[PDB]
Amino acid sequence: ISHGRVFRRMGLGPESRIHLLRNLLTGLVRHERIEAPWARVDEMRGYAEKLIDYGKLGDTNERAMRMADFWLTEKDLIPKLFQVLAPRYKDQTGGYTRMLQIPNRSLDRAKMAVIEYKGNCLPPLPLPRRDSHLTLLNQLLQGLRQDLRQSQ
């Protein structure tokens, strides 16, 4: 039974899970875009968002500095987190990351996901775009919208 269990069991245990997520998060901060197995990306996404929140807390915040020191294994990324990533998202309140599914890994057919920090300098991912508003169904719905607006 795992009712309400919100954390996956990864790696070799709890510490190993944290270290795996830490390595993934460090890679995400360094490269701003990471391919990894979909479950590990999904597990690490929350930590990525929380890292951006801690970076927003400020460079001088001692708790934020300690959290960044733990979660970034390469220490040149801590200035990056506090002076690039957090300022990039100061306006936003959430959704700092974008996670998309990728064709399965050729090695072991693993479910793969690409996770990026929004607003990076890299080429944009081929995002899924909704149908054009000029399609037949959308135009009929636009007609409904206009009639409803006029009538009521």
Partner: protein, 308 residues
């Protein structure tokens, strides 16, 4: 390319039309729900008085959680809150076609998205004029208690001091071993015991050369319908349509439970004072208080009880 593509409502909608459709359909849902708020002004079926041997309809509530409650004798009773969420009478069938010899009312609750329902269900709810409900349960009633489909049902359909039966799917525990599923003793942890600690022992005798049907074995536990009988209705919040039912109710929080008058012989003819067809707020005979209490309940805000 074969033509069996599985589509969902959002698939071909544009960025502009998605919020428009959401808002439009939600507005239609709430308008439909409001259109049923005055059943007595909409050609109600004949409202017969209560007679002995009459069974009225029940509700479909949502299990909110549990909280303590205290009686004037000083005892603590754990109570479970059941919220009646958009519960409506949906269907009526006579004794002949009820799979028995008692009229039946199909009742639904907990409105759900029309985008996620089968076409036949959507057509049924369209003819009924209501948004679709998550669960539909059938209540055996006498013809005295027939109610027109579409009529809403409220927590005040019950009253404090009444006894009730609550049936729901129990918490699903998945494939469970026999120690957890049936409370078998298992085997000792040490003294040479190897690779058998939680296993069933013998499952039968050697003579029959087989295993009896119904033998207790590991398997799926829970997620089956169970009924708790004879639970006292301690309180009713009419504002939020909450029933405070004594003790435990099967199933998890935020799960739909079917609530009906208790079938126990001791509570056979306690329906004299209960709203017989159902409670009609539109009747407006006396606007009920925000909270209806049982006599023994230590109401909050009362001066601290002293056993004088």
């Amino acid at each position: 390319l074969h033509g069996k593509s599985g589509t969902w409502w959002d698939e071909h909608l544009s960025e502009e039309n998605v919020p428009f459709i959401k808002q439009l359909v939600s507005d239609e849902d709430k308008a439909q729900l409001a259109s049923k708020l005055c059943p007595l002004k909409d050609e109600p079926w004949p409202i017969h008085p209560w007679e002995p041997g009459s069974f009225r309809v029940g509700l479909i509530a949502l299990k909110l959680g549990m909280m303590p409650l205290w009686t004037k004798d000083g005892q603590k009773h754990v109570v479970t809150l059941l919220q009646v969420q958009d519960c409506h009478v949906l269907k009526y069938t006579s004794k002949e076609n009820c799979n028995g010899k008692m009229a039946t009312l199909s009742v639904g609750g907990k409105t759900v998205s029309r985008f996620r329902k089968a076409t036949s269900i959507l057509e049924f709810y369209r003819e009924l004029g209501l948004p679709p409900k998550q669960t539909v349960k059938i209540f055996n009633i006498t013809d005295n208690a027939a109610i027109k489909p579409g009529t809403p049902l409220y927590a005040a359909h019950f009253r404090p001091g009444q006894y009730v039966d609550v049936t729901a799917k129990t918490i699903g525990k998945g494939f469970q071993g026999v120690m957890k599923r049936w409370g078998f003793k298992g085997q000792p942890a040490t003294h040479g015991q190897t690779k058998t600690h939680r296993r069933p022992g013998a499952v039968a005798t050697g003579d029959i050369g087989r295993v009896w049907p119904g033998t207790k074995m590991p398997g799926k536990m829970g997620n089956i319908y169970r009924t708790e009988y004879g639970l006292k209705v301690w309180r009713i919040n009419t504002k939020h349509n909450i029933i405070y039912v004594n003790g435990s109710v099967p199933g998890h929080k935020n799960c739909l439970v079917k609530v009906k008058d208790s079938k126990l012989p001791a509570y056979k003819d306690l329906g004299k004072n209960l709203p017989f067809p159902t409670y009609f707020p539109d009747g407006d005979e006396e606007e009920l208080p925000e909270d209806l209490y049982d006599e023994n309940v230590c109401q909050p805000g009362a001066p601290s009880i002293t056993f004088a």
